Enzyme design. Structure first.
Site: not given
Ligand SMILES: *[P@](=O)(OCC)N(C)C
Ligand SMILES: *[C@@H]1O[C@H](CO)[C@@H](O)[C@H](O)[C@H]1NC(C)=O
Ligand SMILES: *[C@@H]1O[C@H](CO)[C@@H](O)[C@H](O)[C@H]1NC(C)=O
Ligand SMILES: *[C@@H]1O[C@H](CO)[C@@H](O)[C@H](O)[C@H]1NC(C)=O
Ligand SMILES: *[C@@H]1O[C@H](CO)[C@@H](O)[C@H](O)[C@H]1NC(C)=O
Ligand SMILES: *[P@](=O)(OCC)N(C)C
Lengths: 532, 532
Positions: A197, A324, A437
């Site tokens: 992420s 996602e 995700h």
């Molecule tokens: P990732 O860092 O997970 C969400 C808190 N996102 C794609 C920003």
């Protein structure tokens, strides 16, 4: 003793930790920077002054000050991502898992946690490096870095709050690994950084930033890439948010010096309490304080750097999860709730489209809506739900990553691409969210091997396969074993665009991950917004 | 005698014609207007002055002056649509097939030929009304009308060449049918007009034009609708083309009177020789001289008339063929040829997109290209060929008709919608062209019943089913028999959008004919071009 390591910063004493009927060494909470507290809040990190005596590295450090998810109090699905140690501005520490007996010079993997640049902890149960370090015989590091305003308040032109300091925190940890990992049996010239992420986007940003390239060998990016629309702002927008923050806390706004001084007298939770009020649009999948394109850490725009090959040329391994979008729709979009099927009306679909593409005009929203609507059946709430899921994930994760993949491969030395689409059997989030995700992390860190965690046999196999891919890639730049069978993860190339899926079924190779939607997001919709 | 009919214009003597082992009466080449020759070229038609004596109605009349397709000399696929009588400006005649013995007051169908408003003949083999008149016991009329500059040169504000006179030719024939068909056993208050392509659009235009509505009962439209992008121009564009025509023939352009006078001294073929040079764009599926939105025949724009319900409210039956685009791609687009499979490169695809949407800017062409490209497989020449086929047919025929259908149904008294997707077994055009527009006409006019024409048994059945649908609808406003079985052709409604397909298989009902592509053509792409 095996638990005592003399480093260039001083001696550390770690702790023996059990893992799957054996043991290994862990050195927890090693400081790599001075505590960024007081008048150092918002400043670039300083290196940790060496110490006499033995540093007690037997327990996890504090986590950085951050917003804490209380949407579902008591729900493990959300609580497992919250800080599990006391929060503190004194939080720049790293953790090292070391095989026993200690290697002489083995592959090193450094983990960078995600959390939208507004949250994250190195000490989560699901980031426990002992299973990976033990199973794949790697030295496993996890770093930490300031998040939120503490990490990314950007008043460009000021040296007191220049922006990107959380990224500089990461680099200082990487500098410490470069200089010292040899004493833990790690090979400083075979370091793989990897993150999920915002950590995946962080990994990509170190590939790009000249001051970071020499500090690691190769890179793994999960569900994030540096060009993601949520992962950076302009210098002017970072400035505007910083001022809007001080305005929320009744700060003197007559100068950068007055503003920064007021923000440093506030207790951390006062900053966290208003952090979300500075966003420019009613939006989902956007975060207040994120990296800034400042002309220093990033010399020019991300797109011209990608176009010109201005980045580290090495091997990369990267990929996405199937669903996602579902997390951010659950938390921010009308019609979605945790305890229902979240069938979406056509009105809630349109509201969701508006939140997901906040920079778009009406023509742009019509384009997105047309693109993702089954007009034979536009009142099917399942299809509206899944359509919005795809919109959010395509726009924010998959199509940015696929753009990065295609630009990187023209200059890099090897790209491997994956599509993780197994939904864990013990997932507590509802079925409609799918393969959420962050839920490949537990397979990467080897949790299905722990029997008390109630994974299936096949999930344990899948975790072992994934851990061996990631670690073999870290060691050699190729996730495949040289002279074993097991069908080979093909190289991603400009002409094939081959990738594999990762699940409990026998692996298949595919081509052109969501190419139809990403031509829309990466080529058509920008040209449309540019013309209107 | 049964072959002698006293009409309000004078006596006519027809001829007994054989049909499928029986006979019927035919009255061929009955004049309904004064010959529009000399100083009457470009003028509104005048009614035919009555005659003494018996008018010999035993042979087909001349066809109107028109461009003649010589693309494939000797090829029956093209030659069957060319004029089969001498061309002449003296061409305003109609033909009537009458059951024997003569009915007292039966259903009447009036056929309006297509041909892009630049060509067409009432006397084609495939328009022979004897099979329909004989099989369904209807009185079958086919009219004629000026085409090309002779029918549609528009110098608005002039009374010498006001435009739309070919449409006024059609109306004068309909006025003659209204006043006289009773003497042929026809019921003047149960007249159905029907036509294909530009004749279908003509049918729709008489629905709209107040001066035409009272002259017929109901309407059938095949592969054409009045709002088609090729079927009308503005008064200013009609003016520009008329001037550009005189400029091609070295005419004095100082006034409408000088211009019109020069064009009336030219022999007809001199006009035909340059007719195609006046088009504004490099385009396919666009014709030089077509109806003009003049404020008289059409009181306001077609779209506001459709929106406000300003049109005849009755029953309609209409539909399209599966491969509307292939003919015009064959004749005008690079990569397509009659004797090959016409697999289209990606370059030829893009050229084709440019020709098919000539009014679009680059953003619009990108939208069309994105919409019709399989990005998993963008160099498949079959898919590029079929993709262009769909572009041309969707944009020019299907989606205009579906727009007309949906606007009409809100105010009309009954809509039946069909999708003709049977390819005739004796088609001489290549397979890649599929179910080519105009190739349902032969089923409507009952040619598969003639055994020497080598149709299959099932094709004969299909023709009989189609003829009985069209004629039952003409008689009652509903194509279904009241108290027979045979699964029913459902009414098209605003909420279901039900339609049937017409082929040799047992009929199926579907919903929302090509709704996905037509939301693109009818709603998205106009808003995009309006914004850029
Ligand atoms: P990732 O860092 O997970 C969400 C808190 N996102 C794609 C920003
Ligand atoms: C290291 O710190 C922990 C924290 O409480 C403590 O329990 C442990 O005994 C310490 N070990 C030492 C000082 O050797
Ligand atoms: C990796 O680099 C070496 C030498 O720099 C080269 O021989 C090899 O082909 C490269 N691999 C790829 C996939 O580009
Ligand atoms: C009608 O005209 C045709 C045209 O040649 C002719 O052959 C036929 O004999 C005529 N019939 C009459 C005048 O009765
Ligand atoms: C046709 O018109 C009659 C009366 O004007 C009405 O009763 C009937 O419902 C109409 N049919 C449709 C399909 O609108
Ligand atoms: P139609 O009249 O048939 C082509 C000659 N067309 C849709 C214009």
């Amino acid at each position: 003793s095996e638990l005592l390591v003399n480093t260039k910063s001083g001696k550390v004493m770690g702790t023996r930790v059990p893992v799957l009927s054996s043991h290994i060494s862990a050195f927890l909470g090693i400081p790599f920077a001075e505590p960024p507290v007081g008048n150092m809040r918002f400043r670039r990190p300083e290196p940790k002054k060496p110490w006499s005596g033995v540093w007690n590295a037997s327990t996890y450090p504090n986590n950085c000050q951050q917003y804490v998810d209380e949407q579902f109090p008591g729900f493990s699905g959300s609580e497992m991502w919250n800080p599990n140690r006391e929060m503190s501005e004194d939080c720049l520490y790293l953790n090292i898992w070391v095989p026993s007996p200690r290697p002489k010079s083995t592959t090193v993997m450094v983990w960078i946690y995600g959390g939208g640049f507004y949250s994250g902890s190195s000490t989560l149960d699901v980031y426990n490096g002992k299973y990976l370090a033990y199973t794949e015989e790697v030295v496993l590091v996890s770093l930490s870095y300031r998040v939120g305003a503490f990490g990314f308040l950007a008043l460009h032109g000021s040296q007191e709050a220049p922006g990107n300091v959380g990224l500089l925190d990461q680099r200082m940890a990487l500098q410490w690994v470069h200089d010292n990992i040899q004493f833990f049996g790690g090979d400083p010239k075979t370091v793989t950084i990897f993150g999920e992420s915002a950590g995946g986007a962080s990994v990509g940003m170190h590939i790009l930033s000249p001051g970071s390239r020499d500090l690691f060998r190769r890179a793994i990016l999960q569900s994030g890439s540096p060009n993601c629309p949520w992962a950076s702002v302009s210098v002017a927008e970072g400035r505007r948010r910083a001022v809007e923050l001080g305005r929320n806390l009744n700060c003197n706004l007559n100068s950068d010096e007055e503003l920064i001084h007021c923000l440093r007298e506030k207790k951390p939770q006062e900053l966290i309490d208003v952090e979300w009020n500075v966003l420019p649009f009613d939006s989902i999948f956007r975060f207040s304080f994120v990296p800034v394109i400042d002309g220093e850490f990033f010399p020019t725009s991300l797109e011209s750097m990608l176009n010109s090959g201005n980045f580290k040329k090495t091997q990369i391994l990267l990929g996405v999860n199937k669903d996602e979008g579902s997390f951010f729709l659950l938390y921010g979009a009308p019609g979605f709730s945790k305890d229902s099927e979240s069938k979406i009306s056509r009105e809630d679909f349109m509201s969701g489209v508006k939140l997901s593409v906040p920079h778009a005009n009406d023509l742009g929203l019509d384009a997105v809506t047309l693109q993702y609507t089954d007009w034979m059946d536009d009142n099917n709430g399942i299809k509206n739900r899944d359509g919005l899921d795809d919109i959010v994930g395509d726009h924010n994760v998959i199509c940015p990553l696929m753009h990065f993949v295609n630009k990187y491969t023209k200059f890099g030395n090897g790209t491997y691409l994956y599509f993780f689409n197994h939904r864990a059997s013990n997932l507590v989030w509802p079925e409609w969210m799918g393969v959420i995700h962050g839920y490949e992390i537990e397979f990467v860190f080897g949790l299905p091997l722990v029997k008390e965690l109630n994974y299936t046999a096949e999930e344990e196999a899948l975790s072992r396969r994934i851990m061996h891919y990631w670690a073999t890639f870290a060691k050699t730049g190729n996730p495949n074993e040289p002279h074993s069978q097991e069908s080979k993860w093909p190289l991603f190339t400009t002409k094939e665009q081959k990738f594999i899926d990762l699940n409990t079924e026998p692996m298949k190779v595919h081509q052109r991950l969501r190419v139809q939607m990403c031509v829309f997001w990466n080529q058509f919709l920008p040209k449309l917004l540019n013309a209107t």
